Design a protein around this ligand. Structure first.
Ligand code: YHR
Ligand code: 1WE
Lengths: 383, 384
């Protein structure tokens, strides 16, 4: 038993969860196309079902999140964290062996439940082990940065491994990685609830801005590979690689603007990020080849990095100024924004792409971001 | 012969707008020996706005030479009337005459530049350099009048402008040859049909909104500076210098980049930047804090102007017949509406609701209107 082991376990758990999220982007549409049969343009019939499939994780996470915390209070943190590995292993095995649309729905729902349990239990365990109030910041920083490395090699790893080795390869590799995390875990050893924190407009504005800045990438996942196969005729292994700018630019932007945003005001960073997101989403559906997406996607990643680096300290300051704040207060509010975005984006986006064209959806999202952008002026100098 | 026409329009806009800004140092102090003075300055925008619809249709039947020569004559008469008049009612009329001359010169010159230059990119370059000349006139005019009123007298700068206008008229007579009435063979679209085109309306609205955003901020800033910052008198003019300098740089630099980057993207980014700059202007607590937002405002306005001037001729070439008088009359009306509305009602609006809410409203309007420039990406052509 040691303090570093819990850090390594939480690191591997969050990495596996985000990797399993991001590796299902270029495999589900390709798998659904290959079973039926560049190719044909029948994917518009199934775009609604593919959109509804991606929202299952967000909906299940939003449902099961309120019940986790009292459960961790009652029976501790180690037992609920172990359930996350079991559910993630079951989901990753069912993904590899699934052949029909029904099983992938169950896989996504199970992944949502396991992700919620693993995240809450791991953060609680890290808070419990470290009790110095200054090393806790470094530990939380490393654990949350584990999401970035997990995000970076997740999306262009299923696409590359799909066309060369097989469809059961990446899921089996993730399963073997998840099994190693459980082996390490075996050798181990209050104020202002969330519904009151969403009753003041200063926090609702920030949460909505985070959600609307992340919806641009939330609704770009299920609809971009189908668009690529329909119009640009790219090979099946470049669909994942078309998302690499959205990760690398996001990491660069979050580093630079976490360093630099305090000098020029956080609200200005948020406003410029939302405007850049809107312009990039507008410029996305004009490309006629794969190389035309290296610019708009990079801008989208940079702008989302701007918003996500300038908004979290604002929420922390707002919670400290007017309420009683704990270690996980900012995390809970941010999680609802991401989950709400991933649950509302794809489900409506599929219906919009069926009813009207794909470019109109991007235009709508860009207009929404631009219109919401002026409202960040409220966040300066809160009382 | 196509290069020298740019020189004629360059000098014509340089001299006409120079008289626009030279008056401001010299008239408010001279009458003393606020609303009365402000309504004087807005007479040019109002009268030039009305004469514009009667200039566009006239250009088909007369040509682009007679209106420009008439504008030169009216400008010379206005500057001579300024140089000798010594009362309020004799200074109102000269401003009205200068407005008429400015309307003639702007519409005729931009139409002639559009007709001489046919390629879209090469026309964008010329319109960029002409707007650069206008910006240089605006920048140079005020200190010129202030220095030669402090040191030499009142009647000196107007007489010097009269001599320069005579030289411009000599150059015009040598180059343009304004001696006969030449009717254009093409019968252009009527001015009421062009207003039913959504794209022309979008372009005119973008120009009007950006210019209104600057035109409200121009007269209503010194009062706020006095009431909050407590700054001396000599910093008032220096506050707005970055806007003029950045506008000159932007209008000389973005005419080249608008074609490469895309007109709609340049206009969108300009409107967003002008909205953010106006939104951040009311937050400064000293003179040094207004350097950034004013420069951003000038750059954004240069972006919008250089992007949306050639777009009018492009739309008229794509959809309607190739006669460029009426569309640039519409563009000049969009230019002049902001200055017509700003000085007259800015004090009333500020006393009614407050300066920061005015800035917030203008910025939010620009930001919301910014998405509508996407519609100018590729307008459909007319049926063959
Ligand atoms: C699924 O992706 C995620 O799940 C993460 C990202 C969401 C989003 C995203 N998805 C993509 C999927 C792609 O596939 C093709 C490609 C590109 C992207 C991008 C680019 C843009 N990107 C941003 C990522 C943000 C991550 O969240 C945090 O970094 C974070 C940090 C904190 O510390 C301050 C928190 O505490 C307050 C916190 O609270 C909940 C969250 C978030 O969750 C961990
Ligand atoms: C030429 C612009 N419509 C007016 C302006 C622009 C920039 C600065 C000051 C004034």
């Amino acid at each position: 038993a040691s303090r570093q082991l819990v850090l390594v376990v939480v690191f591997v758990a969050l990495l596996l969860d985000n990797m399993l999220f991001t590796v299902v982007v270029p495999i589900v549409p390709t798998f659904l196309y290959d079973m039926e049969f560049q190719g044909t343009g029948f994917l518009e019939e199934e775009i609604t079902r593919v959109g509804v499939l991606f929202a299952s994780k967000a909906v299940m996470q939003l449902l099961v999140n309120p019940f986790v915390g009292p459960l961790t209070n009652r029976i501790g943190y180690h037992i609920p964290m172990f359930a996350g590995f079991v559910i993630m292993f079951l989901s990753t095995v069912m993904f590899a062996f699934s052949g029909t649309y029904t099983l992938l729905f169950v896989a996504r729902t199970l992944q949502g439940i396991g992700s919620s349990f693993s995240s809450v239990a791991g953060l609680g365990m890290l808070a419990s082990v470290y009790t110095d109030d200054h090393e806790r910041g470094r530990a939380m920083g490393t654990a949350l940065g584990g999401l970035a490395l997990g995000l970076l090699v997740g999306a262009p790893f299923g696409s590359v491994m799909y066309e060369f080795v097989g469809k059961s390869a990446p899921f089996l590799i993730l399963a073997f990685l998840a099994l190693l995390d459980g082996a390490l875990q075996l050798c181990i050893l209050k104020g202002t609830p969330l519904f009151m924190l969403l009753k003041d407009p200063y926090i609702l504005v920030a949460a909505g801005s985070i959600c609307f800045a992340n919806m641009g990438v939330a609704i770009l996942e299920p609809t971009l590979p189908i668009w690529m196969m329909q119009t640009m005729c790219s090979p099946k292994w470049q669909l994942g690689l078309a998302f690499l700018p959205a990760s690398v630019s996001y990491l660069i932007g979050t580093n630079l603007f976490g360093v630099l945003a305090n000098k020029m005001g956080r609200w200005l960073c948020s406003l410029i990020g939302m405007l850049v997101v809107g312009t990039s989403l507008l410029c996305v559906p004009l490309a006629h080849n794969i190389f035309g997406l290296i610019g708009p996607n990079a801008g989208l990643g940079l702008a989302i990095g701007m918003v996500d680096s300038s908004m979290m300290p604002i929420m922390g300051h707002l919670v400290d100024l007017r309420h009683t704040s704990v270690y996980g207060s900012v995390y809970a509010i941010a999680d609802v924004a991401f989950c709400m975005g991933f649950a509302i984006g794809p489900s409506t986006g599929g219906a919009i792409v069926k009813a009207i064209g794909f470019p109109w959806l991007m235009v709508i999202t860009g207009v929404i971001n631009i219109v919401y952008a002026p409202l960040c002026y409220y966040l300066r100098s809160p009382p």
